[PDB]
Design a protein around this ligand. Structure first.
Ligand SMILES: Cc1ncc(COP(=O)(O)O)c(CN[C@H](COP(=O)(O)O)Cc2c[nH]cn2)c1O
Ligand SMILES: Cc1ncc(COP(=O)(O)O)c(CN[C@H](COP(=O)(O)O)Cc2c[nH]cn2)c1O
Lengths: 339, 339
């Protein structure tokens, strides 16, 4: 059959998996943009100059240290495509974390080496140290998804020393806008093998744009340029993204972050008071992890009411946990009341 | 160095390569669209229902036989990602043809098997027959880029019989809007291993949208779904594409094709009269291949005047040839006068 012609790994593959939507870490409200460049008949630039410069300014890096792609999801893939030789090289991640690291590698055909984090979700530096042989890329989400906490800077120094001249360390900063001070963007000067993933999908409130970035040293960006599609970004996206990255746009973004942090603090306080809520974990992001008694029963009940959360009950060490995206005060009340 | 960590194939890799732009087969004039869906904060559907249904209607296929991607360029990559096992399987194309077939395979790490076409750019069926061992995907551009002619249907039947239960045959119909009658979309019923690439980049005049499609049998589309990025299309693109694919939009498209065919016929007639023009090849597309005496001298001279063409002097059997995209009457005159 046609299926018999497909690659084995593709044949046997784990495909990525009135109501309130608090399940995908998206900003709760739509920010409106309108096209300004009516030049759709022509092919766009590979890397739109306006987008790259506005973002370098914002991130505080040089334009030659930025690469724009279709979301950080593409950034994850590109790194594996340029550095990992399928069948020979490996990827290394630390669960429970973002699922696309393993999906991309499994789709491409690269080995996944896993070293679960410690009980407080911090890095198991000795274990990582023990499994670095044959690893080309290490992914670390900080702040982590789904747990919500930052990785100790001291441990990040250790990981970078361990991988020097052996692997690329990628810090996934998809939610870094919520705790700006914690960004590793300033470490690029000290570490050549450091890469950072950014996105406009969360704090920026532009998930539907599919626009992300990779911050790295020129040598790494240059290698990534050789594996990326010729015109990865559409003109309507590059147009709206440069608009969102204008000074006034950066100011509006910061105001959305502020409003989310305030709503997050309210939500955490209110949930601690709840009986079925055994534990609410602190977060430096736009989502909250919480352990419930009979979480599946609660998940279902809310689901049946039109309140959509993200079950994490199957993730390593997250049994009983549900991830709640922070939305509006009205949506927070709905969850509280429903709980 | 960082470079030493990159894959060998990536290290040694061929990276894709007042004035008049007649060099990229883009429609000469911009057709204006405006966003209608202000929902950018949320993630879009993996495969926008409106885009898929409007295109299935247009192409005359079932929605389950369509897959939308970031241009036909992504369609080329996906097929290799799902069917070719790097280091083990091969791809087969027939030069001189579109360059992305070999670039994608070389980037991914898959072998390229080449069987040059015959002197009239038709398929060398005996040669293909001789090199099918270990090939999973065969690409055939029809009408071909850069030559402009259609592949004999009789020979396509032969290729499909040769590959039955051995490989996927992909017909690249990027320029099929110029010769609709010649589409193989109706053969899907007879051949399970047949895949067709479509795009909105040429006749549709929407290259800046980066929107393409893959027509195939449900079983093939289902396999492709397992290797594609979770949200391959942005909301602004899916919005403008469904607009362009509305009945009235299909009517406007056909009017652009008509205007290009008329301008193409004028351009061919006028160039035959020119001294340095040794031969002008017939085309069923929006570009014309022509052999010039001292083509590089002519290419440069025009280039220095602000008239940008596409040199093909390096392609197998195309020495002396330059590809001219059909634009407006004013642009045709510029080339004629300048010649
Ligand atoms: C930790 C982390 N890293 C990267 C991304 C990618 O976002 P882009 O939109 O820029 O590609 C995300 C975002 N991931 C989410 C939400 O988390 P989850 O519920 O899947 O764990 C949305 C998404 C995009 N592709 C798959 N899922 C991120 O959280
Ligand atoms: C024969 C053929 N097949 C596919 C495509 C892809 O178009 P998408 O925009 O839908 O990805 C093209 C278009 N290719 C061109 C122009 O031809 P050339 O001058 O490169 O030979 C533009 C392009 C897009 N990516 C690389 N080049 C096509 O001609």
């Amino acid at each position: 059959t046609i299926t018999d012609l497909a690659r084995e790994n593709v044949r046997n593959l784990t495909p990525y998996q009135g109501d309130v939507w608090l399940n995908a870490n998206e900003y709760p409200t739509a920010v409106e943009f309108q096209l300004t460049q009516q030049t759709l008949n022509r092919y766009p630039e590979c890397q739109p100059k306006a987008v790259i410069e506005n973002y370098a300014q914002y991130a505080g890096v040089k334009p030659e240290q930025v690469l724009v792609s279709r979301g950080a999801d593409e950034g994850i893939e590109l790194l594996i495509r340029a550095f990992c030789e399928p069948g020979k090289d490996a990827i290394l991640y630390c669960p429970p974390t973002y699922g696309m690291y393993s999906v991309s590698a499994e789709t491409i055909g690269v080995e996944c080496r896993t070293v679960p984090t410690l009980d407080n979700w911090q890095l198991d530096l000795q274990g990582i140290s023990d499994k670095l042989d044959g690893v080309k890329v290490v992914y670390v989400c900080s702040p982590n998804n789904p747990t919500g906490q930052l990785i100790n800077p001291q441990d990040f120094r250790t990981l970078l020393e361990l991988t020097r001249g052996k692997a690329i360390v990628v810090a996934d900063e998809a939610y870094i806008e919520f705790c700006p001070q914690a960004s590793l963007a300033g470490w690029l000067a000290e570490y050549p093998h450091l890469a950072i993933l950014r996105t406009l999908s969360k704090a920026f409130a532009l998930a539907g744009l599919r626009c992300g970035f990779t911050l790295a040293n020129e040598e790494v960006i240059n290698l990534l340029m050789k594996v990326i599609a010729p015109y990865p970004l559409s003109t309507p996206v590059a147009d709206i993204a440069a608009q969102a990255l204008s000074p006034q746009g950066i100011v509006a973004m910061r105001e959305r972050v502020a409003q989310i942090i305030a709503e997050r603090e309210y939500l955490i306080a209110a949930l601690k008071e709840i009986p079925c809520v055994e534990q609410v974990f602190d977060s430096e992001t736009n989502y909250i992890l919480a352990r419930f008694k009979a979480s599946s029963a609660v998940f279902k009940s809310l689901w049946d009411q039109g309140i959509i959360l993200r079950d994490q009950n199957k993730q390593p060490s997250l049994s009983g946990c549900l991830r709640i995206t922070v939305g509006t005060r009205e949506e927070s009340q709905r969850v509280i009341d429903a709980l």
